[PDB]
Amino acid sequence: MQIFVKTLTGKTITLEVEPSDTIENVKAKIQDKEGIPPDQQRLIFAGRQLEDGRTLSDYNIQKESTLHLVLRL
Amino acid sequence: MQIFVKTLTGKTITLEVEPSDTIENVKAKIQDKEGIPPDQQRLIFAGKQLEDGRTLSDYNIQKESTLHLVLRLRG
C-alpha cells in the first residue's frame, strides 16, 4: 500500500509499504529517498513518536496515512 | 573501557570495549555473553537505535554507559 511522509521542507513523499513493515524498515525507505540516516530520523504519527520494532499496523497506520519526519538535532 | 548492557531480563552485564569498536563488533560481544545472534539484536542508547557501521565514539558512548538490548520481534 501507499503511505505519505511529510519531509523536512513540508513536501510529501509517497512510499510503498506493507502493514507488516517495521518502523526501522520504513526509516530505511526514507533514507533512500531523503538521504537522512535512520539514527537521525524521528517518525511521528498522530502526534507521537514511533518505535523502531513496531509494525505500521501496530500503530493502526492505514493506506494513505501521513507520517511526519523530524531530524534529530 | 567498561560499558554495561541491560539484557532481555533487565539484568546488567559488563563488556570490555574500545571507543573505536563498531556497533556490529559490540553485537558480536553480546552474542558471546547472551547467545542472541547479531541479526536478532536491537541495541538502544539514549532512547534511539544504534547503527552497525558507527563506532561507540560516534554516539559519544563513554566508560560506564549503559546500552539496552532488545530482541528483534515485529511488534
Residue numbers in the entry:
A (entry chain A): 1 to 73
B (entry chain B): 1 to 75
Task: Reproduce text from the manuscript describing this model.
The Papain-like protease (PLpro) is a domain of a multi-functional, non-structural protein 3 of coronaviruses. PLpro cleaves viral polyproteins and posttranslational conjugates with poly-ubiquitin and protective ISG15, composed of two ubiquitin-like (UBL) domains. PolyUb and ISG15 have common other structural features: ISG15 comprises two Ub-like (UBL) domains and mimics a head-to-tail linked di-ubiquitin (Ub2). While K48-linked Ub2 (K48-Ub2) and ISG15 are similar both in sequence and fold, the topologies of how the two domains are linked are distinct.
We additionally determined structures of the free hISG15 and K48-Ub2 to 2.15 and 1.25 Å resolution, respectively. An analogous comparison of our unbound K48-Ub2 structure with the only known PLpro-bound conformation of K48-Ub2 (from SARS-CoV-1)28 revealed an rmsd of 10.2 Å. The Ub units are oriented very differently relative to each other, with the PLpro-bound Ub2 in an extended conformation (like hISG15) while the unbound Ub2 in an open conformation with the functional hydrophobic surface patches exposed for binding. In the open conformation, the functional binding surface on Ub is exposed, while in the closed conformation, the functional nonpolar surfaces are engaged in intramolecular Ub-Ub interactions (arrow). Moreover, different Ub linkage types may exploit different interdomain conformational spaces explaining the source of specificity.
